[PDB]
Amino acid sequence: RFRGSNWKKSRRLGISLSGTGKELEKRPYAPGQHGPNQRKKLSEYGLQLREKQKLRYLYGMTERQFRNTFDIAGKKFGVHGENFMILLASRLDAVVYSLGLARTRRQARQLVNHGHILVDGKRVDIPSYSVKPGQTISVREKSQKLNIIVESVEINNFVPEYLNFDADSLTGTFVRLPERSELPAEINEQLIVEYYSR
Amino acid sequence: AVKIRLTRLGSKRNPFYRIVVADARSPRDGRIIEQIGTYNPTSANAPEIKVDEALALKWLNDGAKPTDTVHNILSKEGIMKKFDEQKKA
RNA sequence: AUGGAGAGUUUGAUCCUGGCUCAGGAUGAACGCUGGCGGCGUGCCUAAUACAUGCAAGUCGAGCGAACGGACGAGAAGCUUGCUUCUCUGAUGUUAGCGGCGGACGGGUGAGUAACACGUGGAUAACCUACCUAUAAGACUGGGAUAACUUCGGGAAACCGGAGCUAAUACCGGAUAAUAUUUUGAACCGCAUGGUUCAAAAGUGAAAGACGGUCUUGCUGUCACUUAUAGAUGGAUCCGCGCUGCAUUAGCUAGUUGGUAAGGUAACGGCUUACCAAGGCAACGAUGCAUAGCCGACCUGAGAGGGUGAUCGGCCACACUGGAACUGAGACACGGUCCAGACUCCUACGGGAGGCAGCAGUAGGGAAUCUUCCGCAAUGGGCGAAAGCCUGACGGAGCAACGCCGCGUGAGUGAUGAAGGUCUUCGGAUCGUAAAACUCUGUUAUUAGGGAAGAACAUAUGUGUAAGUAACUGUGCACAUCUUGACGGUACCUAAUCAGAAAGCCACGGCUAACUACGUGCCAGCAGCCGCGGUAAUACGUAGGUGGCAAGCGUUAUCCGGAAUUAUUGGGCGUAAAGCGCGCGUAGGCGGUUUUUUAAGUCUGAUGUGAAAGCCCACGGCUCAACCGUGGAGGGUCAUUGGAAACU
Numbered sequence: 001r002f003r004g005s006n007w008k009k010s011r012r013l014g015i016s017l018s019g020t021g022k023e024l025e026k027r028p029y030a031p032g033q034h035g036p037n038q039r040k041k042l043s044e045y046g047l048q049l050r051e052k053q054k055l056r057y058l059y060g061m062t063e064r065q066f067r068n069t070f071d072i073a074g075k076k077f078g079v080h081g082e083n084f085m086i087l088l089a090s091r092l093d094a095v096v097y098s099l100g101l102a103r104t105r106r107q108a109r110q111l112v113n114h115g116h117i118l119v120d121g122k123r124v125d126i127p128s129y130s131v132k133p134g135q136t137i138s139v140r141e142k143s144q145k146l147n148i149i150v151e152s153v154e155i156n157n158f159v160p161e162y163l164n165f166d167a168d169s170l171t172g173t174f175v176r177l178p179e180r181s182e183l184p185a186e187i188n189e190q191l192i193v194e195y196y197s198r
Numbered sequence: 199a200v201k202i203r204l205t206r207l208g209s210k211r212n213p214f215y216r217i218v219v220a221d222a223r224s225p226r227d228g229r230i231i232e233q234i235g236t237y238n239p240t241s242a243n244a245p246e247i248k249v250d251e252a253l254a255l256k257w258l259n260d261g262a263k264p265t266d267t268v269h270n271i272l273s274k275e276g277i278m279k280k281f282d283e284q285k286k287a
Numbered sequence: 288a289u290g291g292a293g294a295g296u297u298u299g300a301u302c303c304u305g306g307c308u309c310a311g312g313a314u315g316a317a318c319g320c321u322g323g324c325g326g327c328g329u330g331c332c333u334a335a336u337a338c339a340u341g342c343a344a345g346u347c348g349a350g351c352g353a354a355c356g357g358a359c360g361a362g363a364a365g366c367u368u369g370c371u372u373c374u375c376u377g378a379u380g381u382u383a384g385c386g387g388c389g390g391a392c393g394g395g396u397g398a399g400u401a402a403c404a405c406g407u408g409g410a411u412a413a414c415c416u417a418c419c420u421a422u423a424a425g426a427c428u429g430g431g432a433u434a435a436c437u438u439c440g441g442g443a444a445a446c447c448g449g450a451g452c453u454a455a456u457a458c459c460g461g462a463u464a465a466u467a468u469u470u471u472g473a474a475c476c477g478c479a480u481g482g483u484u485c486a487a488a489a490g491u492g493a494a495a496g497a498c499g500g501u502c503u504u505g506c507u508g509u510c511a512c513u514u515a516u517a518g519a520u521g522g523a524u525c526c527g528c529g530c531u532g533c534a535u536u537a538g539c540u541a542g543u544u545g546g547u548a549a550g551g552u553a554a555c556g557g558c559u560u561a562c563c564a565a566g567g568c569a570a571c572g573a574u575g576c577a578u579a580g581c582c583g584a585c586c587u588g589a590g591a592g593g594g595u596g597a598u599c600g601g602c603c604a605c606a607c608u609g610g611a612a613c614u615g616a617g618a619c620a621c622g623g624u625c626c627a628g629a630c631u632c633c634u635a636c637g638g639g640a641g642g643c644a645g646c647a648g649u650a651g652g653g654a655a656u657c658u659u660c661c662g663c664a665a666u667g668g669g670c671g672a673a674a675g676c677c678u679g680a681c682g683g684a685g686c687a688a689c690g691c692c693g694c695g696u697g698a699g700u701g702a703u704g705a706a707g708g709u710c711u712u713c714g715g716a717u718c719g720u721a722a723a724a725c726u727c728u729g730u731u732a733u734u735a736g737g738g739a740a741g742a743a744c745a746u747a748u749g750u751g752u753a754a755g756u757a758a759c760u761g762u763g764c765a766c767a768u769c770u771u772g773a774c775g776g777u778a779c780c781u782a783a784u785c786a787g788a789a790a791g792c793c794a795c796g797g798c799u800a801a802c803u804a805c806g807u808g809c810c811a812g813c814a815g816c817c818g819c820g821g822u823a824a825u826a827c828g829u830a831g832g833u834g835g836c837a838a839g840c841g842u843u844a845u846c847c848g849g850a851a852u853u854a855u856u857g858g859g860c861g862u863a864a865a866g867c868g869c870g871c872g873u874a875g876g877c878g879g880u881u882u883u884u885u886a887a888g889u890c891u892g893a894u895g896u897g898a899a900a901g902c903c904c905a906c907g908g909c910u911c912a913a914c915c916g917u918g919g920a921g922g923g924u925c926a927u928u929g930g931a932a933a934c935u
Binding site for chain 3: 204239
Binding site: 003008009020026027031033034038039040043050056064065068077080097110111113114115139142146147148197 | 692693695781782910
């Protein structure tokens with residue numbers, strides 16, 4: 001998201017959204033380095049490359065890896081106002097550890113990266129790969145039970161559009177590629193690439 | 199030079215061989231009688247013969263030669279021993 | 288065609304031109320704190336430095352005199368009673384070697400390499416082909432020798448010395464069955480040069496062993512032997528292009544300028560010679576100098592399209608230098624003679640040679656090349672039925688932010704103060720429901736083994752089939768005896784494991800966003816456009832946090848973004864980047880055209896039709912990745928077919 005979790009760190013995270021925040025007793029500005037200050041993403045020596053964190057760690061990968069993801073944006077070389085944005089914003093950091101997917105979206109990548117996740121298929125241990133249709137990102141059927149696995153009947157189901165789930169070990173669907181319906185819009189299809197293009 | 203070349207290919211353990219029998223004077227990397235297909239004959243599936251099966255008249259009647267494993271798979275294809283039937287014809 | 292700030296871009300400043308550190312990327316990469324793991328790809332740049340060589344190329348008594356030993360029978364016991372001390376077989380095995388072999392290539396290098404050296408495309412009247420496929424002869428052969436076997440001395444030596452001597456699948460004395468051989472009349476083609484027409488006279492052996500069950504030869508099958516044909520295969524001669532670039536390199540050249548006759552290349556020539564003109568070559572910078580293995584390769588300017596060799600792939604040349612000859616069909620041979628040469632070693636002097644460009648490391652170096660690495664495990668091929676080796680080919684083992692990658696750093700709730708202090712004429716907020724202790728928990732994390740796949744491919748067994756030879760058979764092999772790692776009792780798994788076993792930057796300087804402070808008084812020194820610093824430093828030094836992103840941090844050589852600030856496309860020349868004392872002049876560039884014919888070019892028709900890190904999609908694996916490959920599209924990209932305006 002932002003390299004932060006809103007249970008403790010809702011502050012340098014422009015959006016972390018894990019917990020209650022720290023505007024109540026704490027000052028919610030930042031602990032360091034990712035508040036609204038003079039970071040160069042603008043007229044190129046300006047004041048938005050702290051929101052380059054809102055651009056980069058939103059979809060997880062770090063720069064020179066998010067740089068991989070932006071040339072992946074340029075791969076779908078149709079409408080590079082939208083065809084670059086749709087697959088640039090087509091991953092899952094919401095199946096991952098704490099809150100409702102079963103209880104798996106928030107404190108993100110602790111536990112679901114089992115290495116024994118045993119998807120419908122052989123194995124896909126890393127949700128960085130946008131999951132496939134029919135290939136359900138399940139957990140290890142032999143070590144299945146967790147507070148993050150079968151809690152979708154009560155906390156929250158339905159990861160983004162055309163990407164659904166089940167309850168028995170939380171078998172994903174990903175029946176179709178995700179459009180902007182339930183995909184995010186925080187990464188600007190125009191400005192966030194104008195940091196790259198113009 | 200000349201036996202059925204089970205030719206080295208690929209990245210780290212990707213031995214995607216190719217059906218070939220190298221020239222009587224060229225090396226494994228050099229020129230050849232003729233490249234006949236794109237498959238690894240040591241494939242985990244099978245010998246898995248996909249070749250120019252119509253070319254059995256030229257290189258068998260001039261120069262080519264299998265080695266102990268594919269003379270079988272060629273004539274359960276109807277090529278190698280079957281070219282002996284063609285020569286009898 | 289999809290690209291594109293310059294932190295700035297001079298003067299007193301307003302302005303034009305200008306070029307411009309730099310900040311971004313990749314690079315054979317590499318330089319300055321090793322991290323959770325793993326993974327990729329790769330590989331002496333300097334050190335084409337000397338090279339020590341190991342080892343660096345080996346295969347066949349399934350060819351035979353077979354020698355040797357020796358299977359097996361194996362007289363007689365040689366008597367602490369068990370030999371072939373004997374008959375002949377003397378098989379198989381170094382076979383004594385004589386012979387079929389390659390050995391340039393799996394291996395290496397780009398030393399050199401001016402022109403097809405290669406890239407790269409042609410025409411060929413410029414054709415031959417141990418190993419090779421197929422149609423036509425059998426498996427007639429001299430065995431002198433020939434090591435077989437014997438004999439003659441020397442010197443430590445190198446390595447020689449005299450005397451004789453058997454087999455072969457060696458080869459060879461004598462006749463032979465396959466465009467064989469080139470003439471009489473026989474055609475025209477690309478005039479030269481081909482076209483076999485004619486009739487084949489002319490090809491002519493032999494390699495028979497191991498030999499299947501038997502016909503011990505059918506075809507002697509095998510895998511080794513003689514004869515026309517083509518062909519695989521490769522090379523093969525003749526034209527264009529890059530086949531060189533370069534005058535502070537210009538006048539170049541003399542059987543010369545490359546037909547006729549003799550000669551010779553499968554082909555063909557001044558290649559030498561009796562004749563030919565001084566001619567021919569020319570600032571098309573010939574001559575000459577420099578250079579050269581060549582292409583892709585990558586990056587990339589908007590497209591235009593291009594520079595790109597390290598690797599990496601392809602295509603040339605060289606393998607101690609050189610020189611003569613031999614040669615293997617071809618050799619000047621990575622591991623062939625004589626050698627000069629050169630050194631090396633030896634010397635007991637009498638003479639002998641050696642011989643790193645296989646691949647490791649040796650001295651060495653470097654920023655860089657691992658490791659005098661593994662084994663043929665598999666695949667590979669040369670010779671070899673069978674079978675074998677070379678493996679330093681092959682694959683692997685280590686190496687690594689050269690460049691990364693997912694996981695890496697997991698839970699915040701109750702006192703804002705349970706505890707926390709750059710800057711005080713402190714207010715409680717406070718790096719902070721963070722924090723103790725853990726709400727939520729048991730992946731990576733280490734882990735301890737059941738362990739397992741992969742581990743199948745290759746024969747290995749006659750039951751017997753196909754070739755089946757007169758027929759079961761040796762090989763392929765339905766059986767099926769169950770193999771197989773240069774890797775894995777590790778992966779998969781129990782979850783063992785616990786909130787566990789896994790994060791730094793310039794600064795805290797305007798632009799550098801990282802806070803103000805002190806020793807700091809233009810001092811130290813951080814120090815990028817430019818700075819700061821002089822008793823009120825933010826800045827030198829220091830600091831708790833601290834900033835931009837994380838296996839993260841800044842640089843170094845290359846290209847380009849930057850900046851078309853490098854211009855048909857995408858520069859101008861008064862001043863600015865640049866416009867001639869001058870004018871006068873040949874070829875020329877261009878000078879004004881008005882009409883008209885060709886189809887040669889002015890988005891070929893449509894397809895066989897397309898180089899990788901690189902023409903569209905499909906893919907599979909990639910802890911995502913790291914990176915790999917696969918098919919269609921084979922294109923819609925050349926060739927091939929076209930003829931015709933209003934320019935020519």
